[model samples]
Target: TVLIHVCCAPDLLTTIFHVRDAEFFFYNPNIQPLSEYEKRREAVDKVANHFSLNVRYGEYSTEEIRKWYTAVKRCERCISFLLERTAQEARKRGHESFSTTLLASPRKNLPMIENIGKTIEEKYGVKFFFKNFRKGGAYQEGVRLSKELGIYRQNYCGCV
Candidate 1:
């Protein structure tokens, strides 16, 4: 029915607790060190295995976006890149709707994210499923759950 773009395992607990449908996709090139990909993916695998969910992973490629973006524009563009790819992937997979687990993070710019998704929806023809998973203390609960599970956690945007 839908395809959920998973940013990280730690954010997914609250998302799945509210959303029980759809498969997952992981397409992040934001990690600081290249090696963190393995650790993060391993953690993602652990969470997926525990929850009995499937994942579609993207290539671990590099991007030089810092030079062109301001500190805030960088956030918008980073999210744009992620969700645009999600839109394409959802279309290819025949998904009726798609969303990102990034919405689960309280610090995310929800309106901006919605704008990006809406923009892509017009082009990609895949509905963007929007939900604020941080409501009802879900994001805090999710962080607690991930910590309790001893999953790997990142501090700074998961990038260098």
Candidate 2:
């Protein structure tokens, strides 16, 4: 089964619809403002509860955030940081492959993400399951589901 790095609840909502049995990981150290992080975490919990799925959450480590603040000043690094952590966790838990719900976002570059994932796969030896979830109208459907379920829909991409 695939281990998915969930970026947000709406993204996870679509991801679960496609990969029904995949386990989830929530480790977005990039999200700012503790309130926003809590809101997203609550929303993720809502989705996980509804689907009866297991979620592995990482610490909202302030130290990690400080390091991220200094080091990851680009999208590629940001995405890679999350993916590498997910891959490491996946391997630790004996998962065969890993993917991310970030692929479902229209804002992300799929090929770039795939390239990063491939790089990490070579390093960590955990396969990356790459899928363009936004291609088949999945984003809209996810938004609908989030609204229907009364999930907290964040207006921005967490951090300013």
Candidate 3:
């Protein structure tokens, strides 16, 4: 089994299709402002419901995450914490592999992502399925698919 960290419904739609065999993990703790988080959560639920996919949600409150991460002042730690939790969950659930939708965005740091995944792998014993979902015009394909599937695509990176 593979654990997938879903960021949004549109990405989840594309990811679930590409990695249909993996179980989804909606473990984002970055989306702040309760209302906005709920909106994204609703989208996540819609995707999970439609695909009949199992999703493991994180327990950390958005405020807690925001507070905890303020001092760190690094996006890497935020992502690392979430993905590490997912890795831990995957290992507990008998999955040796885990991945995240961060790789789907072209703007994210590539080396930092790989490094974090590697760190998690070393610590949690869960292998990271490093996938560049944005490769070969996949970003465009994701947009197209989201439009075709009528999935919500938010403009902001949440809590903006």
List per-prediction Cα lDDT, in the order shown.
0.81, 0.88, 0.77
Candidate 3: tens digits of C-alpha lDDT, residues 88-143: 88988999799998778666787899899999999988999887777766678777
lDDT tens digits by residue: candidate 1, 1-160: 8898888888887788788778899877665466777788888888888879888887775443342223327788778887887889998989999999998876788999899999989999999999988887888888888988888887667755
Clash count list over all predictions: 1, 0, 0
Q: Among all windows of ten consecutive residues in candidate 1, which has the lowest summed lDDT?
A: 63-72
Could you tell which candidate, 1 or 2, scores higher by TM-score? 2
* Model 2 lDDT tens row, 55-109: 9898798997886677572888889988998999999999999999999887778
Give the Å shift of residue 155 in candidate 2.
Answer: 1.8
Stretches > 4 Å off in candidate 2:
none
Q: How displaced is residue 76 in candidate 2, in Å?
A: 0.8
lDDT of 3: 0.77
Q: Candidate 3: misplaced stretches above 4 Å?
A: 60-67, 70-73
TM-score of 2: 0.94
